Amino acid sequence: MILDTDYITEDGKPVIRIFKKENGEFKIDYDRNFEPYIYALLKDDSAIEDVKKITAERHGTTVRVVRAEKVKKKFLGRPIEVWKLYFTHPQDQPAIRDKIKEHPAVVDIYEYDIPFAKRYLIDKGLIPMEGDEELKMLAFAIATLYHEGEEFAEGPILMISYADEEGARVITWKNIDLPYVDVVSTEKEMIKRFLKVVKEKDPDVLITYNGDNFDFAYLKKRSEKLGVKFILGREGSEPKIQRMGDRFAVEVKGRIHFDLYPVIRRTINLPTYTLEAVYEAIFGQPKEKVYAEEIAQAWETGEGLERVARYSMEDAKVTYELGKEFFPMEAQLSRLVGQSLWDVSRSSTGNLVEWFLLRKAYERNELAPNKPDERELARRRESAGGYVKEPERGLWENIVYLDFRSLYPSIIITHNVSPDTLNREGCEEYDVAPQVGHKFCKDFPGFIPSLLGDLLEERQKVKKKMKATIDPIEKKLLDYRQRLIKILANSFYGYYGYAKARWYCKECAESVTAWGRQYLETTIREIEEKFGFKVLYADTDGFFATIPGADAETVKKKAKEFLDYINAKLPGLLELEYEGFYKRGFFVTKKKYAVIDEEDKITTRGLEIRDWSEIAKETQARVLEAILKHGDVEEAVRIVKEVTEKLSKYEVPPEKYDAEYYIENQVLPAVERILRAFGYRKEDL
């Protein structure tokens, strides 16, 4: 399988390198015949001879147009003839693109800023991370001597830890009596020992937590200070430090540097992103933090070195565990988007769709539009929000939740919403978005709706293959692919309003939201007027409904009957589904509610919880239980009165003191936010 691609220069000519792992062995394939190129749109084809002679200069080298070729492509749903201009080196493109654009006979230039190594994967139809190859992984972490008024990496590295299938170990230059600690004489010897470990283990993946902005930079500065050959690449190179935006990223040639930090930063939403908080959120297990002051104090003639070595060991161990949890998902994401795991794991959702579209555009001979210039970028201010019903406050019995299956992708497909179909003149059929009035041609399938349709079809083909796959490892992998297709399909709407997007269409985005608001509001009035349901609450693509004075099985039956009715009325791919049944449910405000199923599991959208005392969290759970399991509001009130009395009589442990503070600032605020809708103010208790 393909792990990554890059290029090196030999005699001024680019040489693509394809890093592979085939049949358990590392390989490097070279391609010396891939030519960089750009497209140029001309006002007259006779002008090609003048544009071929356009020159620029990169160093002492004169940059010329090597070869031109007339090509016929599709651009915004219309055929177009452009000239494919070839160059010697990919770095010639930024040097000459402006001179070619400024030529009077040139209307515009295209596909001039697609990185050479990524251009290669797309054009060759190559997909990284494809196959069943087993990748060897190794996580690592470092512990450093920190003092407040010092420069970066002024203090030495105290410990280097690593972890894999064999376990976790710590390399240090102080005598620590632990079985997993390897003692060396100096910091230099510790770094050298780490390099030998990586070289001998030869992992395909190096896993870190913030290694892009800390670990590698620290190791680099210390290796320069100590005169150590910091070679980690499989081809004898040092880690390459790159600038993506305001921060950094690190590549290790021949391997995949998998930094968990950017991945977890976009997967889960947490108040803090410390390694301890992220491990505790994913695995539900606590992890002790040992601060820089404690580590410095312990190192400077300290007995607590075993505690710091254990912290170092746990850093590598949890990094390996987290890497095992997120790597298979990123591998499937890489295979779906068609780019290396290194790029994919560091990319935003908007850029992931862009790479997917760039590949599909090449396969379909679709000329890609350019990224917005600085002027157009400033003009792309977001004007976006679905329908939110104000909830009917109070306690409700036997509530069903109905929602649309992929509402926004269904709208895009059904109404052919795309920049290439927007206000296109000359069609015999159009769909008009309500409120915003944008028209979309229906005669020809649009570029994006066509791909979105194939994504949904591919998702179903993957789901069927998953049910038939006996192999549990492959079943989990197919589960990732099917979930990733859903995520990618549900990213097209956001991509339409993504300011940096090539296929940007604010009109498309507004139209999807407007149609979405229409379908949800139409369905609500339909279930109220034709089935006598009460819609308690609704948000964007679904609603909670019930029949005041009806049995649980009666509500279920009429809900299924409504589904048969409205699904026959809904156009194209739009489909309403039965998501789940709830015995009880109370709706406080927009985005604040709580429901309970027949199993007695409570789902909450406004829970108050580690910067909150256990007494407040326990009372809240007791209140919710009384409301959702017993349906007794009078009991929920009594519980709070009981807890406040136990706190005031000093009968409650302080953590699990100022009795007035824990009543007025802890218990009451956490419980009032739930009992609020009933009219139970703080003065009501």
Side-chain angles (χ1 to χ4, degrees), residues 505-574:
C505 187
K506 185 60 184 83
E507 299 89 347
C508 299
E510 300 169 0
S511 299
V512 174
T513 309
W515 255 307
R517 291 193 319 108
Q518 181 191 268
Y519 290 119
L520 188 67
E521 293 187 90
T522 296
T523 298
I524 290 168
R525 55 104 176 163
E526 276 292 88
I527 202 176
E528 289 171 337
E529 75 196 18
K530 318 286 186 184
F531 286 88
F533 274 81
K534 175 169 203 60
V535 174
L536 309 167
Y537 177 63
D539 190 353
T540 306
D541 63 352
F543 63 100
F544 295 91
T546 190
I547 305 248
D551 316 78
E553 286 296 327
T554 305
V555 168
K556 291 176 193 175
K557 265 272 287 195
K558 36 203 167 185
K560 300 220 91 73
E561 294 179 0
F562 171 70
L563 254 62
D564 282 56
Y565 168 77
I566 211 71
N567 283 326
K569 171 256 166 205
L570 293 171
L573 286 187
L574 282 102

Side-chain angles (χ1 to χ4, degrees), residues 257-316:
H257 168 221
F258 188 56
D259 188 344
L260 284 161
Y261 184 75
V263 179
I264 299 170
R265 182 78 196 193
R266 62 175 214 266
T267 304
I268 179 95
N269 183 14
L270 299 175
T272 177
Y273 290 95
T274 64
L275 183 58
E276 290 71 44
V278 302
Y279 171 77
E280 191 164 25
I282 286 139
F283 296 98
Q285 187 176 2
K287 180 188 186 297
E288 193 197 8
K289 171 66 179 179
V290 177
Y291 300 94
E293 282 72 22
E294 293 155 20
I295 70 190
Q297 199 160 354
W299 187 266
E300 298 174 339
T301 302
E303 286 109 325
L305 285 181
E306 277 153 39
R307 189 174 89 92
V308 63
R310 184 165 69 246
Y311 167 77
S312 174
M313 184 203 53
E314 292 180 8
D315 270 11

Side-chain angles (χ1 to χ4, degrees), residues 307-583:
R307 189 174 89 92
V308 63
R310 184 165 69 246
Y311 167 77
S312 174
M313 184 203 53
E314 292 180 8
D315 270 11
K317 186 190 287 181
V318 309
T319 302
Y320 183 71
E321 291 174 7
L322 286 159
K324 278 204 67 161
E325 189 65 30
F326 288 93
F327 189 90
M329 173 224 287
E330 291 298 313
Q332 292 301 315
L333 182 57
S334 156
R335 178 196 156 198
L336 178 57
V337 166
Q339 298 296 321
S340 78
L341 196 135
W342 191 96
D343 292 292
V344 157
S345 68
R346 294 171 169 81
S347 177
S348 65
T349 79
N351 198 38
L352 292 176
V353 173
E354 196 76 85
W355 282 328
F356 177 86
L357 292 181
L358 279 168
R359 177 173 294 269
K360 291 298 180 191
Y362 182 86
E363 299 174 357
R364 281 146 176 83
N365 198 23
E366 196 74 42
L367 181 63
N370 298 319
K371 257 126 80 148
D373 51 302
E374 52 137 21
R375 175 58 245 265
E376 171 64 21
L377 194 59
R379 210 181 317 177
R380 290 182 177 183
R381 276 178 290 267
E382 188 151 345
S383 78
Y387 170 77
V388 278
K389 188 176 192 192
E390 170 64 21
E392 309 267 351
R393 308 168 87 89
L395 186 68
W396 301 100
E397 185 79 41
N398 302 324
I399 64 114
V400 299
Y401 185 67
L402 307 174
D403 71 333
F404 286 94
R405 298 190 57 168
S406 305
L407 180 65
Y408 287 1
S410 286
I411 290 173
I412 295 172
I413 295 167
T414 304
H415 300 296
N416 210 27
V417 185
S418 60
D420 57 327
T421 65
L422 176 65
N423 300 324
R424 180 189 170 114
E425 287 273 2
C427 304
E428 304 186 75
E429 182 156 328
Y430 295 94
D431 281 357
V432 189
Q435 297 280 286
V436 294
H438 305 301
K439 313 176 203 295
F440 298 94
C441 179
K442 302 301 298 294
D443 297 12
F444 305 79
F447 178 62
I448 288 182
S450 309
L451 303 178
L452 251 190
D454 297 350
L455 276 175
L456 304 191
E457 290 172 18
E458 167 71 3
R459 180 165 185 258
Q460 295 307 315
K461 298 191 294 284
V462 166
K463 297 179 77 69
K464 298 181 175 190
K465 192 190 163 84
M466 183 186 162
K467 304 295 123 59
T469 197
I470 295 100
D471 180 25
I473 279 79
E474 194 185 354
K475 184 188 285 273
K476 279 165 190 184
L477 295 178
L478 295 173
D479 187 27
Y480 291 138
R481 181 174 177 85
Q482 73 92 12
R483 289 188 304 184
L484 283 164
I485 295 171
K486 183 185 198 170
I487 293 173
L488 177 65
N490 284 108
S491 308
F492 279 78
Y493 163 71
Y495 172 84
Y496 271 150
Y498 170 48
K500 308 184 184 186
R502 294 177 179 264
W503 284 271
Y504 175 88
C505 187
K506 185 60 184 83
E507 299 89 347
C508 299
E510 300 169 0
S511 299
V512 174
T513 309
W515 255 307
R517 291 193 319 108
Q518 181 191 268
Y519 290 119
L520 188 67
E521 293 187 90
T522 296
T523 298
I524 290 168
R525 55 104 176 163
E526 276 292 88
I527 202 176
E528 289 171 337
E529 75 196 18
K530 318 286 186 184
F531 286 88
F533 274 81
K534 175 169 203 60
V535 174
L536 309 167
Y537 177 63
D539 190 353
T540 306
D541 63 352
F543 63 100
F544 295 91
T546 190
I547 305 248
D551 316 78
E553 286 296 327
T554 305
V555 168
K556 291 176 193 175
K557 265 272 287 195
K558 36 203 167 185
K560 300 220 91 73
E561 294 179 0
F562 171 70
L563 254 62
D564 282 56
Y565 168 77
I566 211 71
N567 283 326
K569 171 256 166 205
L570 293 171
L573 286 187
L574 282 102
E575 182 192 345
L576 199 66
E577 213 199 343
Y578 187 87
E579 203 64 40
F581 179 82
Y582 305 93
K583 271 297 155 62

Side-chain angles (χ1 to χ4, degrees), residues 88-108:
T88 297
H89 199 279
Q91 294 176 218
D92 292 334
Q93 303 173 217
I96 204 182
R97 67 160 79 129
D98 293 330
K99 294 290 276 198
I100 299 179
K101 175 133 187 61
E102 294 155 12
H103 184 264
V106 178
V107 171
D108 208 337

Side-chain angles (χ1 to χ4, degrees), residues 617-628:
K617 293 151 67 176
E618 179 171 349
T619 311
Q620 185 184 6
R622 283 169 55 185
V623 159
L624 282 180
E625 185 178 19
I627 298 172
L628 292 170

Side-chain angles (χ1 to χ4, degrees), residues 108-148:
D108 208 337
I109 60 168
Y110 300 94
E111 302 185 24
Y112 52 84
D113 54 0
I114 285 92
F116 197 61
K118 298 176 182 175
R119 177 90 272 168
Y120 185 81
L121 287 173
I122 293 173
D123 295 24
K124 295 295 185 176
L126 298 179
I127 306 295
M129 310 301 291
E130 216 180 12
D132 52 24
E133 205 59 48
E134 273 301 310
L135 297 182
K136 187 164 186 179
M137 307 188 289
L138 180 71
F140 78 86
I142 67 174
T144 67
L145 190 66
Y146 180 77
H147 292 326
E148 200 185 30

